[model samples]
Target: MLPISMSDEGDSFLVKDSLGENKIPKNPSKVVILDLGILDTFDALKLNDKVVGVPAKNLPKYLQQFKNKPSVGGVQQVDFEAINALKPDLIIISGRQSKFYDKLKEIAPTLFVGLDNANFLSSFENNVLSVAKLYGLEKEALEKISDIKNEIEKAKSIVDEDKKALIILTNSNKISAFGPQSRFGIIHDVLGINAVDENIKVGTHGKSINSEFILEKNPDYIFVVDRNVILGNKERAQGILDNALVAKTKAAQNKKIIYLDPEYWYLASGNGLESLKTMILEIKNAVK
Candidate 1:
C-alpha cells in the first residue's frame, strides 16, 4: 500500500438527515450515490464532479453525463464491496435505498437525503439545501430551487382551477389514487389544480380503486403514472386506462388524461435541471 499525506481546510458540521443527524464532510471529493433524488440534486448544483459511483441499471438518459462513473448496484442493492473499494467520503441514499442505512454508515459518512412524504416540497427543498451546504454550493442550490419555484408558479397561473383532476398509478390491470401527502400531491396541494376528491386518504401505496370508483368521480382531467413501466412490466398503462369503465368518464371524453414519464415522475420524482423544468412544463401543457 502507498502511504499518502493530505491537508484539509473545511469544517465538518452536523447535517440533519432522515435518521436524526450525522456529521457530513465539508467537501466530499469522493461520493457514491445510490439515491436518484440525491443524484438529481448533485446534477442541479453542477456538482457532478463530486460523484464517483452510481447504480448502472435503469439510469435515466439525462444522467448519462456520468456514464464513466462506477456502478454501486441497483436502487435497492448497493455493491458493498465495490463501494468499499472506492473509499468514498460520502454515501447518499433515499427512498428505495432507505433500508440500507445501517450497513452503509459503517462504510462511510452516510446521509439519508430524502423528502418527507407529508410535505414533499419543503422536504425536497431541505434536502437540496442540506446537500448544497455540504459542498459549499448553497448559492447554486438556491438558484435552482428559485427557478423551479418560479416555473411552478408559471404553471399555476395557467391551471384551470375550476376543473378537478384525479391522480392515479396503474400497474398491470390495477389502479390506485394518491392524495395530497404523496409526492405527486404537489399537483393538487401546491400547484392548486384542485383534486377530484379532497378527502382521499394519503399513503405510500395510494388509495386502491376499481373502475366504478373512477367513473363515479368523473374527473375533468386525469394524471397517470405507470408503475408497470417502473417495474419493467410488459403491460401498458394506456391499455389499463382504456377500459370501458374509465372511458365513460369526462376525462376520457375530453382526452384529458396525461401520462407521465416514469423516468422523471417515479425514478427521480422530477428532480434536477432539465427534469424539473420538463416536469412543470408537462403539467402546464396539460392544464392549459
Candidate 2:
C-alpha cells in the first residue's frame, strides 16, 4: 500500500500516489479514469462532469451514463492515444493498470486507487478523502463515510457474533472459500462475523473446497458469489451448490445461504462509496 497524500504548492499540488510522487494541476478539469471504484467515488462527489475519458465497456448499471462519454478501453486494456487525445490534466487507475503506471504518468499525473483488501476501511477512507480534499468536497464525503460506518455498525450489532460464516465463490461447478484478509474478508474483519474455518488460506483466488468440506465445517451462514453471472453466463451458483452433501450443512438446513451481487462483491464493493453501503445493507437485511 502507498501513502495517499497531497501537499499544496503554487498553482499545483504534489501527490504521493501508489506509483510515485507527482505534481497535479490544482483543479484538474479533464480527468481520465480507468478504475470503476475510483469512478464510483467521483460520481458520489458529483465530479462526473470533470471526467473526460472512461472505460465505458460493460460499465456497471449505476454508472452506465459514462458509456456516452469518450471510451478509453477496458480497465486493463487502456487506449493510450484516446487518453492522450483527451489531454487530461489527471489520470486514475487501479491494480488492473499497474504496469501502465509509467506510461500513464507520461500523459498526466496518475493516481492509483486500488483497495487493500486486508486494510479495507483505512485505505478506502484515505483514497476517497484524498480525492475529496483535492476537489474541496471533504465535508460531503465525510458525511457519506460516517453513514457507511454507522450502517455497518448497526448490522454488526444485530449479528450473532457466535454464528460462523463461510464466504464462497462459484465458477460453474467449482467452489472456493474465503477467510480473513481475503477479498470477501469484510464479513469477518469488519462486519464482526466469525469464520467457520479460520485456517482457510488467504488469497485472491480463495481456498478451493468441495461439498464435503462445507458439510464438515457446517457454517451457520453461507455467503455465495457467482462468477458465472459476472462472466455473462446463464449458470447459477445455486444450481451448483445444491447437492446432497451440502444440503446437510447447518446453513442449508436453516436456509441461510445468501447470494451476493457479483457486480458489488466481485467488482466494486470494497472500493466504492455507494456500492459499499449497498453491500452492508445486503448483509444486514440477510441476518435480520
Candidate 3:
C-alpha cells in the first residue's frame, strides 16, 4: 500500500493531499470524482465501483462508461447539494475544482490531484500511486505504469533527435503555438523532442502565431490540436492551415501535419493514466 500513516483511532489513515493532511477511512467505498485523469486511473485499476459520482459531460470516449453514474456537476462547476447527498467518503478534484477545495473538504475529504506542467510524468505517477496504494492496487498500477513508460521509450527511439517539432492548437480559425513545458509539453519535455521555438510562452493558452511564423520556423513535424473538434465548432484546423504560407513550410511539404485528438491531448492528458498512454501512443504511431 502507499507509505502513509495509519490513524491511532483505527480504520482511518492520515494522508497528505494538495489541501493538507486529513485522516480518511481506508478503502473508501464511495468517491466523487471531478477530474477526468483520476477517473481514468481508477478505471485502469478496476476501482470503478468505488466512484459513486462524476462529471459526466464531455468525457473522453474511453471514459464514457462513467456517464451512467450520478453527476456531481461539470468539471468547473459543482452542485454542493448533489455532492452532499451522495455521502462520498472521498472527493477527488484537479485544477478546475481548486476554487472549491475548501468547500469540498467540508462535505468530505477532498484531494486535489493537479499536475505540474513541467513535471507532468512524475506528478501523474504520484497521483496514481497514492490512490492505488489506498485501494491495495499498487502492483497492478505499477505494471500499467511500466507499460506506459515502455511506450514512451518506443516513441523516443523513433523521434529525430536533431529535428524539432511545433505543437499548435486551433480554435475557431485562430492558431496558437505551444513550446516546452506548456500543456502539450510531453512531446518536448518527456519524449525528448525539441521544440521548434523553445521561447514560446508556457501556458494553457499558448502563444498566438500566424502562417508566416510557421513558414519561418518550418518545423519538421507540426502537431495540431483542434479545440474546435471538442467544442463542436464549424472551423477546422486543416482548413485553417491550408494556406500559401503554411504550404511552403517543411511540415506541410512532408505531410507531417499531425492532427491530434483533443479528447486526450487537450482535455485529460498529463493527469489520467489511460489518457497519458493514449497521448504518447498517438505521437508514437505518427512518427512510425
Identify the leading candidate in terms of lDDT. 2
Model 1 lDDT, residue 81, Cα: 93
Estimate the TM-score for candidate 1: 0.91
Off by over 4 Å in 1: 1-10, 271-274
Clashing pairs in 1: none
lDDT by residue (186-261, candidate 2, tens digit) is 8899998989998888877687899999999999999999888656677889898999998998899999999998
lDDT of all predictions, in order shown? 0.78, 0.85, 0.84
Instruction: Sort the candidates on TM-score, descending order.
Output: 2, 3, 1
| Model 2 per-residue lDDT at 5 | 83
Per-candidate TM vs. native? 0.91, 0.93, 0.92
How do the residues 1-288 of candidate 3 rate in per-residue lDDT, one tens digit apiece? 122223434676677765566777878999998888888888898899999998766566879888689888667667888899999999988777777778999999987777878777878788888788678787999999999999988889888887889999999889999999888889999999888898998877788899999999999899999999667799999899999999898888888899998878877865777888988888888766
All candidates: CA RMSD (Å):
5.6, 1.7, 2.7
Clashes of each: 0, 0, 0
lDDT by residue (tens digit), candidate 1, 1-288 = 111112233587765554645677688889998877678678777788888888877677768887888888777656899899889999887777777778888899877756566666776777777777777787888888889899888888888768999999888888999867676877887688888888888877687898788899999999998988767789988887888988988899998989988778887775455676777788888878
The most accurate candidate by TM-score is 2
**Model 1 score (lDDT):** 0.78
Best-to-worst order by lDDT is 2, 3, 1
